[PDB]
Design a protein around this ligand. Structure first.
Ligand code: NA
Lengths: 125, 131
C-alpha cells in the first residue's frame, strides 16, 4: 500500500483516454513512447507513427460507454487493463468492443501506454 | 554454434492459448501450474450484488479454477492477437466462444500477460454477464 491501487490507476487512465478520444484525439499521442505499440490489422510503433494512425481513423464525436474495467499489477511494475464497452463513432450505432492496455511506469506513479490493442466484437463473430 | 531469431510474439501467444484451452478441456486440475505468486486470475461470474473479483496466487487460483467445474469444456477461438510487452513479456488478447458442461456457447473477452509458460495475469470475462 505504498502506491495507488492498480485499479485506481487503470480506471482513471481509461477515464482520461476515452475523454481525450472524444474531445481531442489529436492529443492522444501524449500517452505513448518510443517502445509503444498501437493496434486498431497491423501494429504501429512510436508516438509519431501512432499519432498518424490515430488521426487516420477519423474519430468524430466518438462516444464511449464503459461497461467494465479490470486492472491488475503486472510484471516490471506495470498495470494491465482490460476494457469492455460500447463505442459510437460518427453518430452510428454503439458497438461492443475489447481494449487491452499495458501501462508502464513513465516520475512518481506516472504511466505511459506501452501496449494498446483494440478490437470490435462484431468483426470477430 | 547456432543463431536463429526468437519466435514472434504471435507464435508464442497462439501456442499458449492452444495449450491453455487444451488443458481446460483435458485436465483443468493442472491449469494452476501456469501461475505463480502474485499471478492474477478471474473467469467471469457475478456476485449476489456485479462482476466477480479476481484472486491471486497459485493456490487460490487453483481453487477458483476448480470452483468453475470445467467439464467437457469446448472452446472455439475466434481472435488471438499477441504483442511484445514489458521485459520482453507477451500480452495476448483473446476472443472466442466457450461451452462448459455441454451448455450453450458463450462469447468471451480475455487478456493474458505471459512472462518472457508463466502467466502473470489471466483476465477472462463472459460478454453476457457484462453487456
Ligand atoms: Na485470429
Amino acid at each position: 500500500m505504498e502506491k495507488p491501487s492498480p485499479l485506481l490507476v487503470g480506471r482513471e487512465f481509461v477515464r482520461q483516454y476515452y475523454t481525450l478520444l472524444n474531445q481531442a484525439p489529436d492529443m492522444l499521442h501524449r500517452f505513448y513512447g518510443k517502445n509503444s505499440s498501437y493496434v486498431h490489422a497491423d501494429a504501429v510503433y512510436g508516438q509519431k507513427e501512432i499519432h498518424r494512425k490515430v488521426m487516420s481513423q477519423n474519430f468524430t464525436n466518438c462516444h464511449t460507454k464503459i461497461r467494465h474495467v479490470d486492472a491488475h499489477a503486472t510484471l516490471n511494475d506495470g498495470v494491465v487493463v482490460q476494457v469492455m464497452g460500447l463505442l459510437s463513432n460518427n453518430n452510428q450505432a454503439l458497438r461492443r468492443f475489447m481494449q487491452t492496455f499495458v501501462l508502464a511506469p513513465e516520475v512518481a506513479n506516472k504511466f505511459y501506454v506501452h501496449n494498446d490493442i483494440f478490437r470490435y466484437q462484431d468483426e470477430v463473430f
